Nitric Oxide Synthase
Amino acid sequence: GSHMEILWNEAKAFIAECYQELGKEEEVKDRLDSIKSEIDRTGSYVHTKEELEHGAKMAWRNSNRCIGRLFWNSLNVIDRRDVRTKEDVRDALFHHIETATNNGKIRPSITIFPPEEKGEKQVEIWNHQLIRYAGYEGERIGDPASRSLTAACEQLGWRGERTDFDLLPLIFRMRGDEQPVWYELPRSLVIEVPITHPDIEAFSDLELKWYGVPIISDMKLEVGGIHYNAAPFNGWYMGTEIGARNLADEKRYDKLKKVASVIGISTNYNTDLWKDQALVELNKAVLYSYKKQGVSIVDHHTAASQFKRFEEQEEEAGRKLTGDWTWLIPPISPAATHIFHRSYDNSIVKPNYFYQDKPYE
Amino acid sequence: GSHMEILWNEAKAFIAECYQELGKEEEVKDRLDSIKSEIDRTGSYVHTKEELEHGAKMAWRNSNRCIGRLFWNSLNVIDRRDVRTKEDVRDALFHHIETATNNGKIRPSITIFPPEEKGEKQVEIWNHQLIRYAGYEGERIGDPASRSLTAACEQLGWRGERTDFDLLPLIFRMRGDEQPVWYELPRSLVIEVPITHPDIEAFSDLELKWYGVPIISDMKLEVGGIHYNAAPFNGWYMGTEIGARNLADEKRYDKLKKVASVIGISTNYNTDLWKDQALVELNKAVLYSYKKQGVSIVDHHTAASQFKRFEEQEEEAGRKLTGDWTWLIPPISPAATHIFHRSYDNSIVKPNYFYQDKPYE
Ligand code: HEM
Ligand code: HEM
Ligand SMILES: Nc1nc2c(c(=O)[nH]1)N[C@@H](CNc1ccc(C(=O)N[C@@H](CCC(=O)O)C(=O)O)cc1)CN2
Ligand SMILES: Nc1nc2c(c(=O)[nH]1)N[C@@H](CNc1ccc(C(=O)N[C@@H](CCC(=O)O)C(=O)O)cc1)CN2
Ligand SMILES: NC(=[NH2+])NCCC[C@H](N)C(=O)O
Ligand SMILES: NC(=[NH2+])NCCC[C@H](N)C(=O)O
């Protein structure tokens, strides 16, 4: 009924905009007629290799919360709409990790899995990120942010060693199955970086480490009415995501007091700004460590400078800029970046990546 | 017409809410009848000493952009609705600086001047803050943020020494005068704090200083339909306002590179996070210097902790909390405070302080 109507309206808007940017404005008429016939025949339509490649790229370009958008057009799109089995999905996820890692020289990539047909999913990825650490709760072990997913993996037969850095398994559900399946990640495929400091030798005593590639696997890619619920993507890390959030937040690894102790400063007074000094050294340490191991990473000052060039290029291309200031500003020294000193329109423009309900909560 | 209607509607809402908090719910009926008779007779109404005192307090409590709201009920309200001459306004502004400074032990205060009667102002303060530094532009001298006001003061006969820290004069306009008048601030009345560091001796070479009390003098206080366009207020500084903004912003004093040089670190690479380290030391220096001189100041961690207790007390009192996250989060280490990790409703609740158009721009 109204589902076939919304699908056709978003398809008309996408094909026109997509082909206008690709320099194929005259091919819009014939393509839109074939799509109308396909929606009436099947109830959906299949994108061409050029369409979803540019659709995933436009989706990144429209991602309000992303500071790394300057590199939108260099996205490596892997088409895996041919997957049928759980082994095919596993192989595709393993391949994504390998090719995106690229021995440290991270390539921004996205793997496109089959979309939803009649509202129901073909492949459903439960992982927040393909590579992530487990969390347990006596006292707190691991990543608190992963507690509910870890509990879901354990209810399926998986069991972790209970260290602070247990790699979660790949957990996904195929159409036809009531429950998901899990696969342990091969250690050779996952690059991890131990955290050391350039000047302070004692920093290694903290025994901190983090994985190299952030691969968000639970967001829905929407391209012209077509819902790609399973479409894992990755860029490289901005240092602050690890040193100012993952390892610093009270509800995460909460390492600021321990960092303050190894760098030789007191945790006695708020006025001494020990949390600030600890944040600076931990963040300097993360950038140094990744660089030493040859794993791509960017600092917040360089990332903001790259983002300014994105703002300039969008105005030069004639497109409106959309952004979410609350997410674009870095968690440390935001006022030292141009982002803090300007405003952004938080309007949602399609194609884009959206949040979807967690099947384990 | 509609002006007498809006005035009566806001008066009804204020008196009911004001007396409900003061425990005088039965006195609402008789007071509202006297106010109706006054609006029909004069076209406005005069607040009692208890009314505007609590009105200014509620206005601070409703200030979305303020982190120091825990101390709302301790506000020192000075009633200067009796001022008639330029000398009376000058004496009142001089007195506000003196009593608010209180030899360093800063008292949060507000001076209430006569409100607008028929849309026209009785006293119009041009200063953004009662104590502020001049700005000129060859090269840049002083505070760039004060350029337009400094130009306005110079067009009136004032002339500064052209140092980086010239105190702007008090500049205000009386009803009946086409142009404003100016008065130079006596040096004895203005407390200034030289910036030194606790561990780094060379920090004094930067010759940085700032004034002790931030007295915002260009905002409009609105209490029950009555517009107090001239109502200067002050609290004490949160360290970051000086060390992370006033002395750090590129469009302000822009001292980060100079700070990095005196603390012995290189400005070569973004990855070394020199801006972050410079921010930490400059901010540690500001807190130390004010404390050494006995001038009240608060760090961002303690201020956020005080603000959390405000959130708790408002829920315990039965009032809805309103806030502007973009302004409540500190400019350095925001993720180390609870503010960053929650949401706030940015709804405007009256009584409040509002921005008004600048008469010099
Ligand atoms: C090239 C390197 C990249 C960098 C430096 C970068 C950086 C960032 C940062 C700092 C955030 C905030 C993360 C957080 O606070 O949790 C973010 C969010 C986001 N990024 Fe990017 N990104 C990159 C690539 C990508 C790619 C390849 C895509 C899409 C194809 C993308 C899509 C998004 C989206 C949708 C969000 C929001 C996620 C959420 O709401 O949780 N990013 N990015
Ligand atoms: C007791 C100490 C106080 C502290 C620690 C405090 C702190 C702050 C801070 C950090 C800001 C942001 C300033 C900026 O970024 O420019 C602010 C804004 C503000 N404060 Fe407070 N404050 C205090 C007292 C007061 C008082 C006494 C009033 C009112 C009677 C008040 C009214 C406001 C308002 C209206 C704003 C917004 C100003 C604007 O929009 O430019 N504050 N305060
Ligand atoms: N303490 C304090 N904080 C501040 C400033 C300050 O002087 N003091 N100055 C500010 C600089 N000016 C603004 C004002 C408003 C907004 C703003 O509103 N921004 C978002 C809102 C985004 C969103 O809702 O997603 C936007 O992009 O439109 C941004 C910068 C920022 N924060
Ligand atoms: N990089 C990055 N930035 C972040 C988060 C992140 O994970 N990554 N996590 C965020 C924590 N969660 C939120 C999400 C939205 C809002 C938000 O919307 N806040 C304002 C908006 C205020 C206003 O408009 O004035 C509010 O108070 O309602 C606040 C915190 C904040 N910023
Ligand atoms: N740089 C990126 N693409 N980040 C995506 C989100 C990663 C998340 N913030 C993390 O710390 O794991
Ligand atoms: N703590 C306060 N009451 N601040 C009011 C604003 C002061 C302004 N931010 C300044 O740096 O001068």
Notes: Residues A 214, 216, 235, 237-238, 241, 245-246 surround arginine (ligand 5) (CB under 6 Å). Chain B touches chain A at residues 244-245, 248-249, 251, 256, 270-273, 275-277, 279-280, 283-284, 287-288, 291, 299, 301-302, 305, 325-326, 331-336, 340-341 (CB under 8 Å). The radius of gyration of chain B is 22 Å. Residues 134 and 150 of chain B are 6 Å apart (CA to CA).
